């Protein structure tokens, strides 16, 4: 039962609840961490920035697996099907480590363009018969 | 004095509660409590490392290597070990040549090796000088000891008896002795003409255990020195010892710089020896036994060795404390020393025979 | 704080994490890193403790090793205890009047060694600017008076470190 | 923070002693030597800390102008401000505005 | 003046060591007697001098009411006054009057 | 087995400790005053104490929770539940509470039962009178 990540203003953060911090014991925290932390880009990839720095984590060489997802390569894209295909592939690659274990049975992710300027990703998992009920929230804005 | 682990737990919990208002990290089985405990463990390890970094600033509580480095920096020099040597009187049976490097081992295991080759042309005993390889206090032996032969020679009897034993076996000074010398050096600074300077000068010469210096002994231009050697049975100087100590104070080379240092040219030192002034106590013991005889005697001897100075007066209470330090006895009333005994600087107090 | 910045930089980098200076991650990072901050402060003050002139934790040990507690160390002023330790640790010198003047002045006093008046060996220690008041500093206790009045600190010091042959004669001036 | 952060301190304050002198006393180096004691230091520290608490600012070590910020915070929490332009009356409610107009003599 | 002019103070304030204990710590003379230290003195005098500088009053050793004058100056600078009759809010500009009246529900 | 033999299990015990509380004008604390912790465990004082002057006083307080949970640590802050005149709702606990033993375990109960079974009769002896006199609380030296 670790801390839960709560999204406000488009940026997630840990939150409190009564005495201590809010706790989570479901796949929600695992998915929202495996999807939205930048992992190291390959040697041959072209970064969206004009820079030469690739993200990652100092613990990537201590945790037996790269941490997050390569969705940050699509920071600045135009409305073309290539970006949608790449986003679908990147989400699949980021979340396939769950299917490798027994924590999920199947993954179905699709990419689409909703109301102009929206990169919509629909990711549907298949939790097994014994998995606990996952957490439930929505992104919120204030001020 | 590093904080304890429970204090570190409390400090981390207080920090967490202060930074996150309205929270109580002390709750059982909670994320903040677990985080606080882990951070407290890490901080305890760090504080222990800090404590080990400390405690080596001073040579007294430093570890071994740091103590040796401190002594080397401060200028204390060690004395290297020696090696024993002596005659062997080995017996042969015909003309033979004992090759250089042969070894004679004693029962204990110590090995003595011949240095130079020896050629023998008779069937009789021959005396050769051998030196030990151990190079330590165990090298020297008694008067008539036996040494076997590790590997046989052409025509030499394996056994070898030394009529006059080996001598010259010493040990390298220990870290405790080095620390004591450094502590003495720091405690009593060198000035070149001070009373502590004269005491350390009279103590540096070999064989001397204690010394005392009286400034302005016989006027405003002279001093006085009086030393006592406690290793020897007499425990009182001889004319040869006095003249050699005077020579050492007059002039001796400094091992550090290589220049010779000594007393000023205008002062009169005139080092001399003390005169015994014995006191004979009369202590009554309830159980009269040889063990209590030895214990009381040794306590009194040590009491004098500690708190007796030439020219000083010893109170009768000292004897009482020394005799009360023993365990087995029940009553220890003293009868002779009922008044304070005092003496002049030439007179040195000493414990005479006790009349039980 | 720099330690909380170091902790935040050590934490992973991505979109999910908020490292703005007003978020819960920062508010918890400060509490997490302050303990190591205090530890680093202790390890840094050990550098000041390295010398007896400024040591505060190890004054007792620096005094026991040096055999310090004696006449030249004043009653209770921690500054004077530090000064006595720092002078005894590096006091080596000759018997000359110039060196004795320098040694006496290094403790804060002022003396001059003038020629005799009756003999040859009896040099005169003329002590000028006598002041027995010592101001309580910020290091010493909260219960100490504002001024501590101590006398005769120089007398026994010079009698202890005087040449063996010579005998001093003290005269106080103003 | 503003309190004594050394290893020498007690988490519970010692009670102050009873009154002894009814006339104001001062310090003197010379003619009786005076010592501070715990009471004077505790009183001054507690006055500063209680002013901070009344203002609502928690004490912090890095900052030094917290007394000025405390005075300004009390000023805002209790009195009207030139920059605010009588916004506190409105924030309070509608009856506050009614009574303010009543006091300014603005009838219907 | 206000600061240490006893020829025993340094020109540059030494840095303040980091916070050690979170809870308040008070002085005690009896299980280890506490000492004030440099940080407490520096912090107290820095707070007083910062209040004086915030009020725009230069410190001077002769006067011993500068804290009261500082508080009064903070008042006269950052608060409404009873003797001014709202004049301060109306010498600023017409937009201030418009905002004040529309706040007080006095409009066309 | 313990019910048959005669050994009784030991129930959970509370935790007691010092409360450092300061009063305003020397009031008298009632016989059953209560304090509360942040988690929501109640502590109670079962005694009456009259305060002579305004100052901090230490009073022995025992928890109302039988288990080990009602066992605080160092410098734990406690607050009153029902206001009392001239008493500030503050309690420091310079020394942490001690106690908080839960129910006896199977091994401990088995050891107690085996002690009961295997212990011998102790007829009146010069040694046994010393123990019997010394078992009473307060008695520290005995002679027979």
């Amino acid at each position: 039962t670790d801390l839960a990540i709560i999204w406000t203003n488009g940026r997630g953060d840990i939150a409190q609840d009564g005495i201590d911090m809010l706790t989570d014991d479901s796949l929600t925290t695992d998915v929202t961490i495996s999807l939205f932390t930048d992992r190291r880009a390959l040697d041959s990839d072209t970064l969206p920035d004009g820079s030469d720095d690739r993200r990652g984590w100092w613990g990537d060489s201590y945790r037996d697996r790269p941490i997050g997802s390569r969705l940050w390569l699509l920071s600045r894209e135009k409305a073309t099907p290539d970006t949608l295909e790449r986003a679908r592939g990147y989400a699949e690659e980021a979340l396939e480590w769950l299917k490798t274990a027994g924590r999920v049975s199947a993954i179905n992710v699709r990419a689409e363009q909703l109301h102009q300027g929206w990169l919509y990703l629909y990711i549907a998992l298949t939790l097994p018969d014994g998995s606990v009920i996952p957490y439930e929230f929505k992104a919120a804005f204030n001020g | 004095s590093p904080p304890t682990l429970s204090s570190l737990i409390a400090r981390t919990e207080q920090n967490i509660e202060q930074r996150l208002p309205g929270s109580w990290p002390q709750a059982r089985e909670k994320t903040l409590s677990a985080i606080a405990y882990a951070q407290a463990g890490l901080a305890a390890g760090c504080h222990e490392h800090i404590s080990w970094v400390g405690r080596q600033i001073i040579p007294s509580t430093a570890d071994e290597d740091e103590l040796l480095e401190h002594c080397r920096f401060w200028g204390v020099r060690r004395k290297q070990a020696t090696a024993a040597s002596g005659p062997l009187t080995v017996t042969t049976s015909a003309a033979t040549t004992i090759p250089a490097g042969t070894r004679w081992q004693r029962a204990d295991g110590v090995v003595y090796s011949l240095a130079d080759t020896i050629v023998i042309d008779r069937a009789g005993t021959t005396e050769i000088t051998v030196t030990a390889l151990a190079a330590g206090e165990a090298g020297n032996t008694g008067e008539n000891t036996l040494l076997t032969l590790i590997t046989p020679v052409a025509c030499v009897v394996s056994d070898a008896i030394t009529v006059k034993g080996f001598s010259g076996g010493a040990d390298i000074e220990s870290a405790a002795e080095l620390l004591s010398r450094l502590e003495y050096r720091v405690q009593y600074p060198p000035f070149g003409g001070n009373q502590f300077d004269y005491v350390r000068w009279a103590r540096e010469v070999s064989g001397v255990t204690r010394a005392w210096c009286f400034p302005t002994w016989k006027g405003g231009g002279t001093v006085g020195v009086t030393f006592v050697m406690d290793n020897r049975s007499n425990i009182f100087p001889q004319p040869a010892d006095v003249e050699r100590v005077a020579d050492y104070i007059a002039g001796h080379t400094d091992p550090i710089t290589g220049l010779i240092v000594g007393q000023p040219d205008g002062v009169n030192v005139t080092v001399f020896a003390p005169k015994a002034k014995p006191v004979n106590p009369r202590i009554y013991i309830s159980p009269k036994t040889a063990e209590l005889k030895q214990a009381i005697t040794n306590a009194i001897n040590t009491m004098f060795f500690n708190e007796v100075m030439p020219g000083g007066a010893l109170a009768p209470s000292r004897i009482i404390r020394a005799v009360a330090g023993v365990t087995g006895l029940d009553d220890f009333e003293v009868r002779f020393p009922t008044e304070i005994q005092r003496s002049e600087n030439t007179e040195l107090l000493t414990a005479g025979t006790i009349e039980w | 704080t720099p330690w909380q910045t170091a902790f935040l930089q050590l934490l992973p980098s991505g979109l999910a994490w908020n490292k703005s200076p007003d978020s819960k991650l920062s508010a918890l990072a400060q509490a997490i890193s302050d303990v190591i901050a205090t530890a680093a402060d202790d390890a840094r003050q050990m550098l000041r403790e390295r010398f007896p002139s400024t040591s505060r934790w190890y004054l007792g040990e620096w005094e026991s090793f040096l055999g310090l507690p004696d006449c030249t160390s004043e009653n209770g002023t921690l500054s004077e205890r530090q000064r006595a330790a720092a002078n005894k640790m590096r006091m080596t010198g000759n018997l000359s009047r110039r060196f004795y003047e320098w040694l006496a002045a290094q403790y804060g006093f002022t003396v001059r060694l003038t020629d005799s008046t009756e003999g040859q060996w009896v040099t005169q220690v003329n002590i000028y600017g006598i002041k027995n008041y010592r101001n309580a500093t910020v290091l010493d206790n909260v219960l100490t008076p504002l001024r501590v009045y101590e006398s005769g600190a120089l007398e026994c010091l010079l009698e202890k470190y005087k040449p063996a042959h010579q005998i001093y004669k003290f005269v106080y001036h103003d | 923070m503003f309190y004594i952060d050394n290893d020498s301190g007690v988490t519970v304050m010692p009670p102050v002693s009873a009154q002894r002198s009814a006339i104001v006393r001062w310090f003197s180096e010379g003619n009786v030597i005076t010592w501070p004691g715990m009471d004077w230091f505790n009183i001054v520290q507690a006055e500063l800390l209680n002013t901070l608490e009344e203002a609502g600012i928690q004490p912090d070590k890095t900052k030094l102008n917290q007394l000025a910020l405390s005075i300004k915070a009390i000023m805002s929490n209790n009195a009207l401000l030139i920059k605010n332009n009588l916004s506190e009356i409105k924030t309070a409610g509608a009856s506050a505005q009614r009574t303010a107009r009543e006091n300014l003599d603005i009838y219907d």
Side-chain angles (χ1 to χ4, degrees), chain A, chain B, chain C residues 2-174, chain D residues 2-30 32-108:
Chain A
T1 88
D2 68 324
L3 308 183
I5 280 174
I6 274 179
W7 271 68
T8 47
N9 276 317
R11 306 232 63 238
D13 53 359
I14 61 185
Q16 290 185 298
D17 167 61
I19 283 188
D20 58 356
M21 329 284 316
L22 180 79
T23 57
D24 192 299
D25 49 359
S26 300
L27 251 312
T28 305
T29 305
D30 284 306
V31 165
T32 193
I33 278 174
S34 193
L35 260 179
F36 283 95
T37 76
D38 317 326
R39 87 197 263 161
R40 178 155 210 84
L42 292 194
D43 214 317
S44 42
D45 265 349
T46 63
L47 318 174
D49 315 328
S51 94
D52 50 46
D53 161 41
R54 324 173 146 84
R55 289 96 170 281
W57 188 35
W58 84 265
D60 278 304
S61 43
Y62 276 134
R63 62 160 301 108
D64 192 78
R65 261 193 303 108
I67 164 166
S69 81
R70 264 193 294 161
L71 287 182
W72 66 279
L73 282 181
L74 316 182
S75 199
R76 31 166 294 188
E77 281 315 92
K78 65 166 74 171
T80 44
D82 195 15
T83 85
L84 302 145
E85 227 189 17
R86 284 211 293 164
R88 173 173 198 254
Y90 288 167
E92 262 171 19
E93 141 196 297
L95 265 176
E96 189 263 359
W97 78 266
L98 274 179
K99 174 172 51 93
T100 282
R103 282 163 70 78
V104 293
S105 287
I107 313 304
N108 293 318
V109 47
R110 94 194 187 207
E112 205 177 40
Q113 175 183 13
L114 282 201
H115 329 297
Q116 282 101 12
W118 278 45
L119 185 39
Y120 184 92
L121 274 151
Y122 176 74
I123 322 155
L125 301 84
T126 45
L127 301 192
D129 314 276
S131 278
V132 73
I133 278 187
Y135 189 46
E136 190 33 59
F137 73 94
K138 283 154 116 170
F141 305 87
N142 53 7
Chain B
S1 85
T4 59
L5 201 137
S6 160
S7 159
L8 276 180
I9 285 178
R11 177 197 290 179
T12 298
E13 290 194 25
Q14 298 152 345
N15 283 17
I16 290 273
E17 179 172 355
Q18 190 220 11
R19 291 286 116 186
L20 291 149
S23 199
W24 181 267
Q26 212 154 359
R28 256 87 190 177
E29 311 294 271
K30 293 302 179 53
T31 45
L32 295 194
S33 154
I35 275 172
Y37 185 87
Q39 179 67 288
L42 290 196
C46 165
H47 273 296
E48 218 282 342
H49 190 11
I50 285 174
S51 163
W52 181 94
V53 154
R55 195 174 68 194
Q56 308 191 81
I57 280 177
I58 44 170
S60 94
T61 59
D63 293 301
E64 178 50 50
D65 206 318
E66 276 84 10
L67 198 149
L68 280 192
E69 214 288 325
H70 275 112
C71 301
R72 195 225 74 190
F73 171 51
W74 268 95
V76 190
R77 267 134 163 76
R78 251 181 171 185
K79 184 172 71 43
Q80 309 297 331
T82 62
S85 34
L88 206 66
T89 76
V90 71
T91 170
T92 173
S93 172
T96 184
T97 67
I98 318 178
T102 169
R103 317 144 186 176
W104 287 271
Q105 58 176 358
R106 78 180 194 183
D108 179 60
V110 195
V111 181
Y112 301 78
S113 79
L114 168 67
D116 178 31
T117 172
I118 303 287
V119 50
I120 312 186
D121 44 357
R122 294 171 311 81
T125 80
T126 315
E127 174 201 274
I128 55 186
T129 89
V130 304
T131 76
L133 297 195
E137 179 67 86
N140 42 49
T141 81
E143 168 111 358
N144 47 108
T145 182
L146 293 105
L147 281 83
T148 81
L149 201 35
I150 283 176
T151 64
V153 201
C155 302
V156 175
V157 175
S158 176
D159 198 299
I161 165 168
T162 84
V163 277
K164 188 186 320 178
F166 314 117
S167 179
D171 288 343
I172 174 175
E173 326 181 54
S174 42
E177 284 142 321
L178 286 181
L179 167 69
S180 180
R181 286 173 53 193
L182 169 63
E183 196 163 340
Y184 189 86
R185 194 268 188 213
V186 156
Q187 283 192 25
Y188 298 121
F191 268 91
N194 277 21
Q195 37 181 6
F196 324 114
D197 287 326
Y198 286 108
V199 173
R200 74 177 180 85
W201 275 340
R203 188 184 306 253
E204 279 192 10
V205 58
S206 155
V208 171
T209 308
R210 271 176 297 153
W212 295 274
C213 165
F214 318 99
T216 60
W217 186 29
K218 283 190 189 332
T222 184
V223 308
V225 192
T226 286
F227 58 98
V228 166
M229 289 156 189
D230 277 296
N231 288 306
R232 300 193 309 185
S233 327
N234 195 3
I235 312 205
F236 280 109
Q238 297 285 346
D241 313 354
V242 161
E243 61 86 14
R244 96 183 189 185
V245 161
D247 197 313
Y248 187 81
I249 292 179
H252 67 300
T253 83
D254 213 348
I256 296 160
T257 175
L259 310 152
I260 75 177
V261 297
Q263 74 206 43
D265 273 14
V267 316
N268 307 29
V269 190
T270 84
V271 53
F272 70 103
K275 293 197 194 306
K277 179 182 198 302
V279 56
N280 299 102
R282 268 185 311 259
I283 321 100
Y284 154 65
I285 323 178
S286 161
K288 298 197 187 288
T289 322
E291 293 320 302
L292 296 194
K293 289 176 182 57
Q294 181 70 249
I296 293 188
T297 46
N298 274 17
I300 293 174
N301 291 125
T302 306
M303 159 60 71
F304 276 64
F305 169 80
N306 260 348
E307 322 176 44
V308 156
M309 159 171 89
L314 84 82
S317 61
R318 267 61 197 118
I319 313 297
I320 278 289
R321 174 174 311 147
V323 65
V326 189
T327 66
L329 85 176
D330 289 0
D331 296 338
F332 46 68
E333 173 199 339
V334 308
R335 320 175 158 286
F336 184 110
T338 51
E339 79 288 343
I340 293 181
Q341 287 92 355
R342 54 189 71 83
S343 79
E344 307 89 38
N345 51 3
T346 318
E347 301 274 326
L348 159 68
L349 265 297
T350 311
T353 65
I354 280 80
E355 337 290 358
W356 303 120
Chain C
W3 290 98
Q4 76 142 346
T5 303
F7 185 86
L8 289 183
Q9 280 159 328
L10 286 182
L11 271 192
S13 63
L15 188 56
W17 313 85
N18 196 341
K19 294 162 172 168
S20 39
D22 78 9
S23 162
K24 280 324 169 189
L25 259 76
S26 183
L28 174 133
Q30 283 185 9
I32 282 316
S33 90
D34 251 343
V35 197
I36 282 64
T38 77
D41 273 318
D42 279 5
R44 213 170 47 93
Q45 186 214 40
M46 218 62 89
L47 277 190
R48 153 181 310 280
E49 299 255 329
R50 184 185 40 192
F51 309 130
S53 194
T54 54
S55 66
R56 189 188 87 233
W57 281 336
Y58 278 64
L59 251 192
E61 276 81 354
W62 274 114
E63 285 172 336
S64 89
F65 166 70
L66 262 77
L68 173 55
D70 72 32
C71 75
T72 184
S73 90
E74 299 285 64
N75 165 316
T77 47
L78 211 156
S79 161
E80 286 316 305
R81 305 212 289 150
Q82 285 181 352
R83 197 190 291 271
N87 278 18
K88 175 153 201 43
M89 191 175 128
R90 45 162 161 134
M91 152 164 57
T92 88
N94 209 9
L95 289 82
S96 40
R97 296 174 185 186
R98 318 260 81 75
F99 172 80
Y100 270 111
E101 287 163 305
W102 174 73
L103 177 84
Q106 203 148 28
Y107 285 89
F109 310 93
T110 298
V111 309
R112 299 191 302 285
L113 299 204
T114 319
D115 252 351
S116 156
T117 169
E118 55 158 291
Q120 175 204 242
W121 318 96
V122 184
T123 86
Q124 183 164 122
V125 186
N126 297 117
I127 304 149
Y128 285 80
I130 167 180
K131 49 166 55 185
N132 296 359
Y133 78 114
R134 320 207 68 119
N135 316 64
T137 87
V138 310
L139 248 172
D140 40 45
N141 203 348
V142 77
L143 214 33
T144 67
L146 273 190
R147 283 195 176 159
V148 283
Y149 272 116
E150 201 66 280
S151 178
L154 162 86
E155 298 260 49
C156 34
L157 201 172
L158 274 180
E159 303 293 87
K160 182 158 73 92
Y161 290 139
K162 84 163 168 58
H165 51 279
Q166 264 211 356
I167 164 160
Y168 279 121
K169 170 63 185 317
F170 296 96
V171 189
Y172 288 123
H173 307 172
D174 287 336
Chain D
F2 290 170
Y3 39 78
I4 171 152
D5 54 0
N6 305 332
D7 287 352
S8 67
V10 282
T11 51
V12 54
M13 85 169 273
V16 278
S17 173
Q19 187 159 334
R20 278 162 208 141
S21 196
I23 311 173
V24 282
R25 310 215 155 273
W26 307 91
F27 288 76
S28 69
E29 279 144 6
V32 46
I33 318 286
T34 173
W35 63 88
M38 77 214 179
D39 293 318
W40 185 91
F41 281 133
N42 267 16
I43 280 162
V44 169
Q45 173 186 320
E47 293 299 329
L48 293 199
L49 287 196
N50 274 252
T51 283
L52 266 198
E53 169 302 324
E54 182 46 289
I57 327 165
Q58 307 281 44
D60 213 328
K61 186 160 295 293
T62 89
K63 275 176 298 313
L64 305 187
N65 60 305
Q66 290 215 10
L67 193 69
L69 299 184
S70 172
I71 288 172
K72 211 175 307 303
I74 302 191
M75 170 145 324
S76 60
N77 297 0
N78 271 327
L80 321 167
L81 281 84
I82 309 182
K83 59 194 56 53
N84 260 41
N85 266 356
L86 319 94
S87 187
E88 310 76 39
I89 316 177
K90 173 188 180 181
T91 308
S95 167
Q97 306 168 198
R98 192 110 172 95
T99 303
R101 257 174 305 117
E102 282 325 299
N103 296 11
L104 271 193
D105 187 29
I106 314 193
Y107 301 150
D108 53 8

